[PDB]
A paper describes a structure:
Merbecoviruses from bats, pangolins, and hedgehogs pose significant zoonotic threats, with a limited understanding of receptor binding by their spike (S) proteins. Spike (S) protein is the major viral surface glycoprotein of MERS-CoV and forms homotrimers. For the MERS-CoV S-trimer, NTD is known to mediate cell adsorption by binding sialic acid, while RBD is known to bind the human dipeptidyl peptidase 4 (hDPP4) as the entry receptor. The S2 subunit mediates membrane fusion and exhibits a higher level of sequence conservation among CoVs.
Notably, the S-trimer of CN-HedgehogCoV was identified to adopt both locked-1 and locked-2 conformations. All locked-1 merbecovirus S-trimers we determined are found to bind fatty acids in their RBDs, while fatty acids were also identified within RBDs of locked-2 SA-BatCoV S-trimer (right). In the CN-HedgehogCoV-locked-1 S-trimer, the Domain C residue I613CN forms hydrophobic interactions with NTD residues Y50CN, F267CN, and Y321CN of an adjacent protomer. These hydrophobic interactions are stabilized by a hydrogen bond network involving Domain C residues G612CN, I613CN, S615CN, F618CN, and Y620CN, and T55CN, N259CN, and V318CN of the NTD from the adjacent protomer. In addition, the interactions between Domain D and S2 of the adjacent protomer are altered: In the locked-1 S-trimer, Domain D residue Y354CN interacts with S2 residues D784CN and K913CN, while in the locked-2 S-trimer, Domain D residue Y354CN interacts with S2 residue K786CN. Despite structural changes, the interaction between Domain D residue S353CN and S2 residue D784CN is maintained in both the locked-1 and locked-2 structures. In the locked-1 CN-HedgehogCoV S-trimer, no density was observed for residues 677 to 690, suggesting that these residues form a flexible loop. In the locked-1 structure, the hydrophobic core is centered around F355CN, whereas in the locked-2 structure, it is centered around Y354CN, resulting in structural changes in Domain C. A similar reorientation of Domain C/D junction hydrophobic residues was observed for SARS-CoV and SARS-CoV-2 S-trimers transitioning from locked-1 to locked-2 conformation. In contrast, S-proteins of CN-HedgehogCoV, EU-HedgehogCoV, and SA-BatCoV are unlikely to bind sialic acid due to changes in key sialic acid–binding residues. Among our determined MERS-CoV S-protein structures, receptors for Japan-BatCoV, CN-HedgehogCoV, and EU-HedgehogCoV remain unidentified.
Numbering used by the authors:
A (entry chain C): 50 to 84, 90 to 202, 211 to 290, 294 to 338
B (entry chain B): 339 to 575, 581 to 676, 691 to 727, 733 to 820
C (entry chain B): 1013 to 1198
D (entry chain C): 772 to 856, 864 to 880, 884 to 892, 903 to 939, 947 to 1109
E (entry chain A): 1013 to 1060
The structure:
Amino acid sequence: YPVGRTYANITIMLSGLFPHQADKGKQYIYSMYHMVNDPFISNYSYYTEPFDNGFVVRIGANSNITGSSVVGSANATVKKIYPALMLGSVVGKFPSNKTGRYFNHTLVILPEKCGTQITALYCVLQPKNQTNCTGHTTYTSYVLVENKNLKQSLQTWFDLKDCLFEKKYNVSADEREEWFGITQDQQGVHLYTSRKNGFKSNNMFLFATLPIYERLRYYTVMPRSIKTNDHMAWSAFYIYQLHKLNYLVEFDVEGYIVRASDCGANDYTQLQC
Amino acid sequence: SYGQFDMNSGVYSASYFNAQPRGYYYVANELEECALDVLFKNIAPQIANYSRRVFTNCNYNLTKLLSLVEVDEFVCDKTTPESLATGCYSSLVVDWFALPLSMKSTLAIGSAEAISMFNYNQDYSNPTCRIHATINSNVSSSLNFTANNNYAYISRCQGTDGKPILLQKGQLPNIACRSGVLGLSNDVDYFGYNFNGRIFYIGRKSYTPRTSEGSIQMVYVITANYAEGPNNVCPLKTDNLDSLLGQCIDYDINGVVGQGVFQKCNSTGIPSQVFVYDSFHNIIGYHSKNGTYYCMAPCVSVPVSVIYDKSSNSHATLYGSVACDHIKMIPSVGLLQTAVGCVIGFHNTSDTVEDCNLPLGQSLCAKPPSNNTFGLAVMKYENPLKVEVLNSSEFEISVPTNFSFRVTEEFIETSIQKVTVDCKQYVCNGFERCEQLLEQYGQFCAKINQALHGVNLR
Amino acid sequence: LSKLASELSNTFGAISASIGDILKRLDTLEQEVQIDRLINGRLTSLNAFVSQQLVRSEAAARSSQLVKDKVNECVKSQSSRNGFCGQGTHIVSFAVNAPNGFYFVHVGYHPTDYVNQTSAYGLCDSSNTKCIAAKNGYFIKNGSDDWMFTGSSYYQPEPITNFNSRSVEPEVTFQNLTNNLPPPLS
Amino acid sequence: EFIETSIQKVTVDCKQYVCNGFERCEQLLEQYGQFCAKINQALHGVNLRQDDATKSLFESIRVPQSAPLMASLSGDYNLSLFETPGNYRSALEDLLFDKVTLGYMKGYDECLICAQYVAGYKVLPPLYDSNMEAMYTASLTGSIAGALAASLPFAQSIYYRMNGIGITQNVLMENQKLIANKFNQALGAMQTGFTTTNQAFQKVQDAVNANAQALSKLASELSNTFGAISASIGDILKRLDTLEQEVQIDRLINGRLTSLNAFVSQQLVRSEAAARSSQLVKDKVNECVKSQSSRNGFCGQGTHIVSFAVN
Amino acid sequence: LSKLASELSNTFGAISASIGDILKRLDTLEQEVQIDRLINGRLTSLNA
Ligand SMILES: *[C@@H]1O[C@H](CO)[C@@H](O[C@@H]2O[C@H](CO)[C@@H](O[C@@H]3O[C@H](CO)[C@@H](O)[C@H](O)[C@@H]3O)[C@H](O)[C@H]2NC(C)=O)[C@H](O)[C@H]1NC(C)=O
Ligand SMILES: *[C@@H]1O[C@H](CO)[C@@H](O[C@@H]2O[C@H](CO)[C@@H](O[C@@H]3O[C@H](CO)[C@@H](O)[C@H](O)[C@@H]3O)[C@H](O)[C@H]2NC(C)=O)[C@H](O)[C@H]1NC(C)=O
Ligand SMILES: Nc1nc(=O)c2nc(CNc3ccc(C(=O)N[C@@H](CCC(=O)O)C(=O)O)cc3)cnc2[nH]1
Ligand SMILES: *[C@@H]1O[C@H](CO)[C@@H](O[C@@H]2O[C@H](CO)[C@@H](O)[C@H](O)[C@H]2NC(C)=O)[C@H](O)[C@H]1NC(C)=O
Ligand SMILES: CCCCC/C=C\C/C=C\CCCCCCCC(=O)O
Ligand SMILES: *[C@@H]1O[C@H](CO)[C@@H](O)[C@H](O)[C@H]1NC(C)=O
Ligand SMILES: *[C@@H]1O[C@H](CO)[C@@H](O)[C@H](O)[C@H]1NC(C)=O
Ligand SMILES: *[C@@H]1O[C@H](CO)[C@@H](O)[C@H](O)[C@H]1NC(C)=O
Ligand SMILES: *[C@@H]1O[C@H](CO)[C@@H](O)[C@H](O)[C@H]1NC(C)=O
Ligand SMILES: *[C@@H]1O[C@H](CO)[C@@H](O)[C@H](O)[C@H]1NC(C)=O
Ligand SMILES: *[C@@H]1O[C@H](CO)[C@@H](O)[C@H](O)[C@H]1NC(C)=O
Ligand SMILES: *[C@@H]1O[C@H](CO)[C@@H](O)[C@H](O)[C@H]1NC(C)=O
């Protein structure tokens, strides 16, 4: 959504940072504990995708329906599960020759207490020296675990030092899909969410401006599993990368957007813009 | 407007008149005082690692700040310091570092030194104000302003391939090169650096930001964002709504000023963001703090026209579509209601005229005042001689019995004035400077001469 | 021409409209800017005049075609159609010169006073043997079934002869007569 | 066939369009040289030319004799579309003015037109009222079926039209009811289904859309920044100093004056087209309407029989 | 068409008629002025 102003019942050619047509993006899925012990996780955390201008995620789509457990052999219903994201400036190599270490001040985003609270820690992490938790040549990907505060698992996997603002936001517990976008400008980083101004559509509005004056260049999605025999499955969230593009949107009577052609998907849309 | 006294008789248009704004409105929802004391509180940052703060929803008092600094030179584009202390803008971004006035041209636009390419590079897309301020010793000791005597800037930032790393506009310096410069304790010009595996080449060059008297020189770059929404950063420096409605009124709401009329419309748009805009970037809406949506419009001028009559020397005023009601409510800046509009002159007459040389609009004439004002005459159709249709074999005819010649005079202009213009003699007056600037301007005289020759030959 | 020559006194947002005054008062890096503004204004005025002449050329050409048509229709001949050569029924037209054009003098007819009368489609005898119709006229009655002939543009009745009467095919809509028949019908 | 013989009578003033009433912009326009008086003179000239052209056109429309009763009842053919009775307006004219996306006594109190009034221009009313124009049109009917003047029924007049084409007397008297059925079928086919697929109604809508688009562009060249920091002179006055205000206001004045000159040239071109259109309308009325033409193509495709003209 | 394509080589008071030539020569603030002058010239040619 445009920041600071509202339009109504008009169609505007406005340019900004938007995802383009198609572009299904990366598809990420979390899973239950292996059916008890040894929580099951995916290849994530060895991938450091470029931040570029920013990204927007589809929060908790494919929920309220019957799906399938990723590690389970049977089918179960799927609920909304909030991703936890890592964002930093410089990435390097672990002592175990694995990728995913952030060598300076990094921003993490953690949902807390069964999705009631979400926190943003700007908290530079030192790798703890232990037996298997990021030791010498004994490594598996750090996993954020919780029962049926994720910072305790993070402090088990990492060491926290020079930590700054721990901004906490209250989000309601529901199974409706949302959206969440991160954009960086010269005023800092901007977080966007769909929960503000009531909850009516899929549009996102500005709700936080964290003072991150270092240019964020990499991001990764930290794995997360839930302790739970029982068959509980979790939804999928898709990451879409933004671009310096131009759009032509349409507003209804309320301050919302109904349809928005992308000027550049094909020639007819170039004419339509 | 026309510039001559003797005027042909006819109906003209004699420019609009607007309604002057009578009153004042002001909301300016209260905010917190700024944290600008941090600009003079801690150790002065160096150019290599310079601090940046962003101020939003803030109020600042410029006299208390400017009682502490001595401005040596300010360079501002798209804004002025006089406007910064009077006007309200959306956001304020301040960068500050220590830099002597002997290198005040290093930060100038277009310079080719190491600071403009490996240190803070200014961004010119928003209104900026780079201020070179000197803080004297007494105020520096009062606010615990100190110098660490270790100030340096990056003089080379090369990668592994032996090429310099240019810095993008309006960004902090490269984190590897900044850390490498900050970690050193001497001056080096080409020094290798091991940034967790990467091999970087860095160069540190120092400078002294103080003077003989101990006064510390500083550089304050201030970027102000003028956005379309409400302005929440204001400098520190009547009635209520529904006591005014339908009156042209200047605003002071959330730092936005102007003029126009408020009305109580139904709520339209999102309730959070205060103002509502149209396609032409013109503000038309306003959401109050009480949830009442005030729809906003410009105060609309009154379209007027003047009927002038030579050989009687009489002037009358007509209004284009203005009703007599809106004549009575607002100043213009008997009143006969007419299908065009209310007129301040004229007198009614139960008359008709076949044709009028002074038309007023939809079949209305203005006959010359031969009591004391014009006569509103209405043109209506005369009917031709009706002939009845007969069902029988005998039909009605109309054979004339008398006649008279009517001479018809028609003039058809079939010529144009054949004109040729010397382009050099017209654009310039023979001066060699203007001739050279027209030659460097790209030639146009050949095309003009060809076009006039073509139309004259045609 | 007045609008063309009045753009020499327009400052166009400069210090003066005289190039020599700008040359004397100002330094070089501003001299080029002021003369650039002056050049922009004067060239805009010249292009506006060129477009004005080009627009007026089309109107002059259309008016030339119209003058040719009016001369070849209303002057050298009497026009059958009405309204193309002035108000009324055309009689004669004289063409004379004029400032930047042609002046036309059309002489109409313009009947003044009218008489309400009745007439039939044609006169035929008995059992529709041979019927006649009016040629540039109308058939009028004195009131005693005495049919006479009148002009199409003036009232002066004259007896019907074979010269102003043209034979036509019999129809049903004609008026049948019994006594005092005209000599063409005898 | 539709022939657009009118232009919009639009007047723009000096300072309400180039400026917004600020004394700084007015002073910088007075130092910029005098242009807007020329704009007012040119617009007054083209409006006077259009009013005189309309007066001459409706003088040439007028017939000396007319039969009001003939169009209403006498014709066995269902010619009630051109029968005149609030409004003295025929059925076809009501269909034309109703099925397009196109008053003056209280137009200010309404509030699109108020957007014109704040922007700084108005649309002048036409010289003849809609009722007077419709009555001038309705007087033209009643003289179509007259001469070979003499008042005639429409059936006999149609017989005389078709007799000279090459259809003999026995042919037309044999199957006159078939002729009336064909005429009524053609008129009914024209009346129904003419609002979606025809070139003439598309031309009417195109002319109305172009006349709206001219004013839309004239009002939309107010929001162009023209390289300045803002499109509002108030923002430029508040934001910049007294030395850089002159440059930005000069750029704004250049843009607005260029837009006004472009609109004036557009009005001149449209007037030069409308003069030719008015001459063509006069020719079509004096050839195809009051009489029966002998040359094909000039009164539509095919051999001409009869023609009617409506607003 | 010859007059339409001959206005690309018009400097219009700028240092050069090529926008690429202006971009590599002048700073950020003067680039705006020169490109504004060029844009005004090309738009005037198009409207003509
Ligand atoms: C899966 O099913 C759940 C049912 O619990 C869906 O939640 C419901 O979603 C609808 C979407 O229209 C919500 O309606 C909207 O609610 C907001 C609340 O302010 C209101 O302002 C809107 O006008 C509209 O009525 C509904 O409230 C919500 N149910 C609850 C209890 O919150 C969910 O959307 C489904 N998910 C998918 C992907 O289909
Ligand atoms: C911005 O900050 C300045 C401080 O430099 C404020 O000026 C202060 O204004 C107040 C009242 O206008 C002054 O108080 C007065 O002091 C005299 C004695 O000096 C006393 O007799 C009066 O009754 C009153 O209390 C104060 O002295 C003055 N400060 C200085 C250093 O001169 C200014 O008001 C601030 N701006 C705003 C909008 O508040
Ligand atoms: N853990 C888990 N999460 C899931 O989301 C899940 N989903 C399924 C199957 N459910 C789904 C979810 C989405 C679509 C789907 O992508 N819908 C459409 C979109 C069509 C369009 O783009 O318009 C499709 O691609 O078919 C289909 C089946 C099975 N097991 C799961 N298990
Ligand atoms: C480089 O600059 C940053 C920002 O000015 C300094 O970071 C601050 O350091 C102080 C002291 O440790 C803290 O109290 C602040 O909270 C820090 N702020 C931020 C935003 O990180 C940093 O110390 C400077 N580097 C050096 C070597 O002096
Ligand atoms: C200053 C060196 C004088 C001699 C240089 C001679 C020739 C080189 C030619 C062109 C490059 C000139 C660089 C100008 C840098 C000054 C601006 C600054 O530094 O901010
Ligand atoms: C929105 O704009 C359209 C444009 O035609 C208008 O018809 C409609 O009445 C407006 N208001 C709504 C949809 O509430
Ligand atoms: C898993 O990630 C590693 C990166 O460490 C990559 O090399 C490998 O191809 C990935 N495997 C799959 C199946 O995605
Ligand atoms: C990044 O971390 C290293 C680790 O020692 C530190 O030296 C460096 O100063 C940090 N970067 C910044 C910008 O402080
Ligand atoms: C957030 O929620 C907690 C408990 O649910 C409450 O104490 C706190 O005040 C809330 N904060 C806000 C800003 O609503
Ligand atoms: C006087 O003016 C009124 C205006 O409403 C009009 O109705 C009336 O006919 C006029 N009287 C005349 C023309 O005699
Ligand atoms: C007149 O008489 C003839 C005689 O046959 C007839 O054919 C014709 O129809 C009659 N006309 C009228 C009008 O009665
Ligand atoms: C003529 O046609 C119209 C519309 O087709 C119809 O309403 C009317 O009744 C018709 N008149 C007749 C059949 O007399």
